[PDB]
A paper describes a structure:
Penicillin-binding proteins (PBPs) catalyze the two last reactions in PG biosynthesis (GlcNAc-MurNAc polymerization and stem peptide cross-linking, or transpeptidation). Class A enzymes can catalyze both reactions, while class B PBPs act uniquely as transpeptidases. Within the elongasome of a variety of bacteria including E. coli, Caulobacter crescentus, Bacillus subtilis, and [name], PBPs have been shown to interact with, and be recruited by, the essential protein [name], a bitopic membrane protein that is essential for cell shape. [name] (residues L38–L588, thus lacking the TM helix) is a 588-residue molecule that presents the characteristic fold of class B PBPs, with an elongated N-terminal region followed by a transpeptidase domain that carries the stem peptide cross-linking site.
[name]:[name] complex crystals yielded diffraction data to 2.7 Å and harbored two 1:2 [name]:[name] complexes in the asymmetric unit. Diffraction data were phased by using our structure of [name] from [name] as a model in a molecular replacement experiment. Two “butterflies” are present in the asymmetric unit of the complex, but only one interacts directly with [name], the other one interacting uniquely with its partner [name]. [name] interacts with [name] by inserting its C-terminal β-domain between the head and anchor regions of the PBP, forcing the anchor region to “sway” by ~15 Å away from the head. Direct interactions involve mostly the head region of [name], which recognizes [name] through a hydrophobic zipper generated by surface-exposed non-polar residues on both faces. These include Phe169, Phe182, and Tyr222 ([name]); Leu69′, Phe71′, Tyr127′, and Tyr134′ ([name]); Phe169 ([name]); and Tyr134′ ([name]), forming a π–π stacking pair. The fact that hydrophobic interactions (more feeble than polar interactions) are involved in [name]:[name] recognition indicates that these complexes can form and be disrupted as needed during the cell wall elongation process.
Numbering used by the authors:
A (entry chain A): 41 to 519, 533 to 588
B (entry chain C): 92 to 248
C (entry chain E): 92 to 247
């Protein structure tokens, strides 16, 4: 009869690849010096002295501490004394370690992010299985390597793969005889993302001294070619546990590097909502895109005056012109005549209430403020003033850069893309619009066209020098003489090319102090897509 | 810089093991320094001085290990052996491109051999997921011609 | 360098077998050094001086072992024996190419024999996974006759 013996076959964690098969995330073969468990205190000391010689850069006692610790292996035996040893460091040591009978040196994997802080908020990082992680998915135990944030986390099961095992007949000498059973481990554990590494490096360059977020998206299927959040952080600093020094540096950086700003940060959309608001007017009222009304510097309604962004005012203006010139009063006036229940329905239909459905963990839904919402949070009534400030994307209105992006690609396309990173995530388009609404879209596009291309357009002086025709909408959100943190945030979203929309771009600079000021960044990205043949 | 000094075997250490030999003493070597052994322009194993005795541990001995490189891209691994006493290159990166028949040479990174001494050729390749192994053919094992005319490899430390 | 010094067998040591003989003393040998024994230009066994007695342990004997090489590639093994008291070459790597009929000669690396002395020919080969063995034919088998012209092999 005798007895048998089991051995797990643990697959290497899958690679993460760029659109064009560049490496974003991979593994590095490194070493580890191990001693057997359950050893005499006298002997253990003499072996640590031996291991001190080979690594004089570690202290005789820091190696005690490593012995009994919360580390270890997947095996019925062996304890890791020194870990993370570079291959090159092992080069003169391997043979010397082999000469000593009870000392083992074994190959280990260490995750590696070649580009460091590139797309750090997309890729995320892996860490040591928490005792709660082992509970979550029992199979996290064989590697003790699990995704903590972003894609590494969202696609952990895939990237990690499935263990196999191999059961074998053995003799007393505990040597291998017949294989009695084999179950093989999974193999194709790799993952391809839609990002383009060149386009993201451009994105980083553009936000070089700036905080905020930037997004490029194929508006026909929802692929994200760019997703920057600034500051990014260097994923490699987490791999072997984070140091007390670097954790302080990240936590106490006031610009908040750990914040994912395209999916886990909320900002007032500002004027960018205006074509969604206009679409509601046309739908619910008895008016048209050509309905022209007088647009003074401000209006009065009761006790208070609702002011337009520039002193001078904007003469007579229709829908096309109100979009073009980011005019406030057109929306103030028709906002008087629209119920917040119907406006909010249209805004929520164009994707501001809910998650876009991005393949990351914990996407934020916004707040499309309405009657019932103000009651549940503040217990205060819905005054007309609330309808009005909301009709220009401010007050209690919050969205994510993702929401604005999906929204912008709905306008341009007529259908709603689910943004995603995993190329093999076939996300069908969604059709949340009726007949009437789709027809009115062109009107809205022409407006966006005019923002960038008509000389009156808010974004004319800034978006010139573009190799393709652009269509945009600017925004500004309240929080030259103004100190940095008091400054309004800056939006600009846009689709391209105008003549047949395919891509959408959405940019947000924290304290960017005005939406038009971001046209110089939009062109540079739209040109990079031209330069690289996407257009 | 590097020296080759001739040496010869006086006997096997055990008569139940062909991969371990006693070598004639050589003037001022360092004790416990691991030296390389070369015969017909080939790596046959290593040698260590211990308590005044110069011992040769040949290819496929438990204690014989050293650094080698494979093919023209000089893919790195370490020499070991297996249960069938075949010479094996262990611990190769899984992404590395190896072909059956590729030359295997000493890497000269271990301070045992200089670079470029012939070891063998890749005959088969095992996947162990986090790394790969290569089993060699045309390497020195059991062949009596190469146990004469032996030189010790002293790489200046 | 190497020397052959003559001696002859005087008597068998054991009453249970023919594998062990007393040899006529030879002046100035070293004690416990293992010497080779040769007769008709063939390896017949080994000899050791112990406590003043020159003892021959012939091919089949439990204490007789020495280094041999097989065939044209001079594959190494050691002389031993097996459960059927056949003369065997043991300790051969399984990956070695040896064939039935291959010449078996002393390897001359063991400090017992010089190289190239005849031992036998391979008659069969057992594969044991971790090693292989080769059973010999035409080798000296340790028989009834007390030989008169044996030479002791002294390697220095």
């Amino acid at each position: 009869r005798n007895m048998t013996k089991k051995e797990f076959l643990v697959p290497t964690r899958g690679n993460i690849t760029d659109r064009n098969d560049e490496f974003l995330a991979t593994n590095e073969l490194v070493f580890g010096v191990f001693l057997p468990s359950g050893l005499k205190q006298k002997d253990l000391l003499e072996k640590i002295e031996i291991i001190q010689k080979f690594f004089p850069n570690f202290s005789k006692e820091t190696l005690l501490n490593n012995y009994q610790k919360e580390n270890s292996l997947y095996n019925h035996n062996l304890i890791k004394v020194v870990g993370f040893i570079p291959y090159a460091t092992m080069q003169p040591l391997y043979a010397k370690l082999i000469q000593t009978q009870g000392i083992f040196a074994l190959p280990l994997d260490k995750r590696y992010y070649p580009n460091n802080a590139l797309a750090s908020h997309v890729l995320g990082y892996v860490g040591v299985a928490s005792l709660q992680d082992l509970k979550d998915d029992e199979e996290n135990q064989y590697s003790q390597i699990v995704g903590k944030t972003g894609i590494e986390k969202e696609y952990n099961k895939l990237l990690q793969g499935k263990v196999g095992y191999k059961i074998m007949r053995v003799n007393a000498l505990n040597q291998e005889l017949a294989t009695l059973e084999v179950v093989l481990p999974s193999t194709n554990n790799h993952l391809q993302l839609s990002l383009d590494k060149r386009l993201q490096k451009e994105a980083d360059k553009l936000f070089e001294n700036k905080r905020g977020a930037i997004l490029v998206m194929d508006a026909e299927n929802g692929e994200l070619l760019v997703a920057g959040s600034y500051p990014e952080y260097n994923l490699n600093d987490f791999v072997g546990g984070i140091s007390q020094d670097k954790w302080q540096k990240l936590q106490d950086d006031i610009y908040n590097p750990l914040l994912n700003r395209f999916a886990n940060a909320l900002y007032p959309p500002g004027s960018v909502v205006k074509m969604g608001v206009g679409l509601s007017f046309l739908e619910n009222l008895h008016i048209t895109e050509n309905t022209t009304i007088p647009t003074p510097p401000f209006i009065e309604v009761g006790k208070h005056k609702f002011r337009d962004w520039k002193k001078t005012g904007h003469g007579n203006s229709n829908l096309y012109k109100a979009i073009r010139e980011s005019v406030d009063v057109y929306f103030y006036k028709f906002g008087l005549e629209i119920s917040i229940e119907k406006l909010s329905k249209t805004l929520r239909e164009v994707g501001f209430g809910e998650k876009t459905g991005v393949d990351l963990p914990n996407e934020f839904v916004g707040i499309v403020p309405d009657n019932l919402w103000k009651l549940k949070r503040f217990n205060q009534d819905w005054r007309v003033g609330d309808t009005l400030i909301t009709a220009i994307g401010q007050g209690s209105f919050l969205a994510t850069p993702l929401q604005v992006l999906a929204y912008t690609g709905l306008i341009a396309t007529g259908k709603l893309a689910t943004p995603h990173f995993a190329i093999n995530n076939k996300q069908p388009l969604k059709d949340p619009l009726n007949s009437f609404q789709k027809k009115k879209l062109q009107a809205l596009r022409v407006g966006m066209y005019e923002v960038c291309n008509h000389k009156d357009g808010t974004a004319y002086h800034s978006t010139r020098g573009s190799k393709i025709t652009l269509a945009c909408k600017t925004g500004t959100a309240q929080v030259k003489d103004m100190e940095y943190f008091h400054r309004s945030h800056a939006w600009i979203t846009a689709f391209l090319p105008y003549e047949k929309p395919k891509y959408a771009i959405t940019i947000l600079v924290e304290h960017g102090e005005g939406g038009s000021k971001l046209g110089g960044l939009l062109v540079k990205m739209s040109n990079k897509l031209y330069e690289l043949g996407y257009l | 810089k590097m020296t080759y000094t001739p040496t010869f075997m006086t006997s096997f250490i055990s008569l139940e093991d062909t991969h371990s030999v006693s070598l004639n003493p050589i003037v001022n070597l360092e004790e416990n320094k691991i030296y390389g052994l070369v015969s017909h322009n080939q790596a046959i194993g290593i040698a260590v001085l211990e308590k005044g005795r110069l011992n040769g541990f040949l290819n496929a001995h438990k204690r014989c290990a050293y650094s080698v490189m494979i093919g023209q891209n000089q893919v790195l691994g370490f020499i070991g052996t297996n249960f069938k006493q075949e010479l094996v290159v262990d611990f190769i990166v899984p992404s590395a491109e190896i072909n059956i028949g590729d030359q295997v040479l000493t890497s000269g990174l271990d301070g045992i051999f200089g670079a470029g001494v012939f070891v063998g050729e890749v005959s088969s390749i095992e996947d162990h997921y986090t790394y790969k192994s290569a089993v060699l053919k045309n390497a020195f094992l059991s062949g009596a011609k190469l146990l004469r005319h032996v030189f010790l490899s002293d790489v200046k430390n």
